[PDB]
Amino acid sequence: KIYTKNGDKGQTRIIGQILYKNDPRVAAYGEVDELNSWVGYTKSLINSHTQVLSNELEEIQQLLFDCGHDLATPADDERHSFKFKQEQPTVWLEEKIDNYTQVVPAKFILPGGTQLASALHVARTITKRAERQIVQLMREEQINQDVLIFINRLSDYFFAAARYANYLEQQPDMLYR
Amino acid sequence: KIYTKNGDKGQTRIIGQILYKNDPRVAAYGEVDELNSWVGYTKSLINSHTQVLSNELEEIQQLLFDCGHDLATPADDERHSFKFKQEQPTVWLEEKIDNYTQVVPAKFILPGGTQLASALHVARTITKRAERQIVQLMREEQINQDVLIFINRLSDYFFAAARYANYLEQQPDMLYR
Amino acid sequence: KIYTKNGDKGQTRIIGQILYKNDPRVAAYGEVDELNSWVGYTKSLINSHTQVLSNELEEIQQLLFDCGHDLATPADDERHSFKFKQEQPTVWLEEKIDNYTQVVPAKFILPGGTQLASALHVARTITKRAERQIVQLMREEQINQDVLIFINRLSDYFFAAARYANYLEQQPDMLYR
Ligand SMILES: Nc1ncnc2c1ncn2[C@@H]1O[C@H](COP(=O)(O)OP(=O)(O)OP(=O)(O)O)[C@@H](O)[C@H]1O
Ligand SMILES: Nc1ncnc2c1ncn2[C@@H]1O[C@H](COP(=O)(O)OP(=O)(O)OP(=O)(O)O)[C@@H](O)[C@H]1O
Ligand SMILES: Nc1ncnc2c1ncn2[C@@H]1O[C@H](COP(=O)(O)OP(=O)(O)OP(=O)(O)O)[C@@H](O)[C@H]1O
Ligand SMILES: [Mg+2]
Ligand SMILES: [Mg+2]
Ligand SMILES: [Mg+2]
Ligand SMILES: [Mg+2]
Ligand SMILES: [Mg+2]
Ligand SMILES: [Mg+2]
């Protein structure tokens, strides 16, 4: 049974230590879970016009699992150790950003356009929400700061990705009048 | 007029007592509202392949209204009384979990796949978000603990439901590499 | 480069002043961003049956940019000044509410129905979430109270809009049994 009932009183285990479910840690690992499921949702909207975006989103979902793992791990835990390193993943998001920025037409942009592009804009803001929550934790506990670097860059990726999605289906970006 | 303007100063009534809208109670009843509307959204994605899931999601929406009612009710309120009982509803979610678990192929799963399945994964994480917020309240006030038992089981249902949705449209679950 | 890396340590600038990203202000401007991207998502679901709703949603996105601007502006800032006025925008939402209320069939309604209507119900609850967060800020800092009046009315609009969306595609509202 996937349901243990150990949580019915509002408490839960992390990597290693029973916390309340409103604990800033659980919230951080939790928002990254919501973001990941949203990314999965965004990916399912992919069609024949926007099919190139499929792999990288699948990749980001794997990266996000690692992020949630480390976030669920206390920094002083003797038995359990940070597994996420920001360098390769973040550099990789930076190339896609530069690539998508040069492709698209160079006022402030409002989030919307194609269904996929709008969903990419949604992921941009859910990324930020998870990030605020990761900073709330960082402020009370030691975290893998690598997670924070990557997440920060990730919302930028999403913006870049959104504009590109609009581009792939001949759709102008929504601009603030 | 559905707009009274009584709220324009950031205050609102609950069952019974004027609270601030950022009050942990309002937040709890509020996240359950967001979850319910998300469930409604998920249900609207149902097609001919996934049509069996329609009734139970509609049912969950009724269950969630009862949950939000009790959450909006102070435990010491003389005039107003808890209406949600977890036993029948939660047992019913447990049978669907066991049924969906035995049907599907038995690594950690990443949220995604069909549009409906991904949307079910989204509801799984929104359920948890509302749950964290229900624990935040539980920690300062007396709540219907029955609500918390059900909500906890509900995110488990959603996981089970998501895998099944992927199954109904011949789609393998996304797995952590 | 759209990525400055100035934020990788969890801090960010507002209008004018470096804050933490979990700062109640950033959260307020942030939830309004998420709501706006959600509105954009809702708009992308528009088809031939529901095409009249397109302009007003685009309009709301512009209104929401102004709201986030003012929310990101300290009230005592000498160089920077509130740009959102609730009167015209809010009156305009009130006419659409009265118009949509008279059109639709006059029990409590559960959020769901057509895909667009359900997505409008989602925006109704995301509006409220951003509103709770705007009250959390209002409680510690001076805000443009005009923003709060409009946002409050905006969730009411969304309810009205949702019922209308269901109406435009011959779909009965989901009712609490
Ligand atoms: N409401 C929540 N929000 C975010 N993360 C959670 C929440 N509840 C649990 N988790 C985390 O995700 C993991 C898997 O979730 P699970 O539902 O199994 O937790 P639980 O409530 O403790 O267990 P159970 O549902 O069996 O009682 C948990 O170990 C915990 O770290
Ligand atoms: N921002 C919010 N988030 C979550 N729940 C809310 C919020 N505002 C109100 N509610 C709850 O939902 C009920 C219905 O919402 P409603 O918008 O009518 O509240 P209000 O703001 O007090 O009224 P009005 O919009 O007429 O000024 C309220 O009685 C309150 O309990
Ligand atoms: N996590 C967040 N949630 C909500 N709002 C944010 C967040 N991070 C930044 N903002 C706001 O939106 C603006 C644009 O976002 P941006 O990502 O450029 O911020 P940053 O993290 O400071 O910069 P960078 O990503 O270049 O390091 C910022 O100036 C800030 O006011
Ligand atoms: Mg479980
Ligand atoms: Mg940033
Ligand atoms: Mg109202
Ligand atoms: Mg649980
Ligand atoms: Mg940036
Ligand atoms: Mg209101």
Could you report how far apart the first and last alpha carbons of chain A are, in Å?
54
Where residue A120 sits, what CATH number does that domain have?
Answer: 1.20.1200.10
Q: Which residue of B has its CA nearest to A20?
A: B135
Q: Is residue C6 a part of any domain in this protein?
A: no
* Residues in B touching C114 (Cβ below 8 Å): 44
How many domains does chain C fold into? Answer: 1
Write the single-letter amino acid at A114: T
Measured CA to CA in angstroms, residue A63 lies from A39, A92, A95, A139, B93 at distances of 12, 12, 16, 23, 32
User: In the block, which residue shows the tokens 């948890």?
Assistant: B128
Range of C137's domain?
11-177
Give me the helix-helix angle, B24-43 and B115-138, nearest 10°: 170
Nearest CA to C33 among C7, C64, C72, C73? C64
Asked if residue A1 belongs to a domain, the reply is no
Determine if ligand 2 sits within 6 Å of the CB of residue B108.
Answer: no
Q: Is A2 contained in some domain?
A: no
Cα separation, B31 vs B129, in Å, equals 7
**What is the B18 CA–ligand 2 centroid distance (Å)?**
11
Among B residues 6-45, those touching chain C with beta carbons less than 8 Å apart: 7-10, 20-22, 26-27, 30-31, 33-34, 36-41, 43-45
Write down which chains contact chain C via at least 3 CB pairs under 8 A. Answer: A, B
The answer to whether the beta carbons of residues C159 and C124 sit under 8 Å apart is: yes
Give residue A8 CA to ligand 1 midpoint distance, Å.
Answer: 10
Q: Is A128's CB within 8 Å of C34's CB? A: yes
- Exp. method: X-ray
C125 touching A (Cβ < 8 Å): no
Q: Is residue A18 part of a domain?
A: yes
Cβ atoms of C80 and C16 within 8 Å: the answer is yes
Three-class DSSP category at B175: strand
Any domain includes B1: no
CB atoms near residue B160 (< 10 Å)? 24
Whether residue C129 is contained in a domain is answered as: yes
Domain for residue A128, yes or no? Answer: yes
Are B3 and C115 a contacting pair at CB < 8 A? Answer: no
Contact assessment for residue A175 and residue A109, using Cβ atoms and an 8 Å cutoff? yes
B121 Cα: distance to centroid of ligand 7 (angstroms): 14
Question: What resolution, expressed in A, was reported for this entry?
Answer: 2.6
CA of A154 to the centre of ligand 8 (A): 9
Lookup: tokens for A69: 């793992």
C111 vs B8: CB contact, 8 Å cut-off?
A: no
> With helix as H, strand as E and coil as C, how does chain C read?
CCCCCCCCCCEEECCCCEEECCCHHHHHHHHHHHHHHHHHHHHCCCCCCCHHHHHHHHHHHHHHHHHHHHHCCCCCCCCCCCCCCCHHHHHHHHHHHHHHHHHCCCCCEECCCCHHHHHHHHHHHHHHHHHHHHHHHHCCCCCCHHHHHHHHHHHHHHHHHHHHHHHHCCCCCEECC
- Any domain includes B68: yes
Q: Which of B3, B8, B12 to mutate to test the pocket of ligand 2 (most atoms within 8 A of CB)?
A: B12
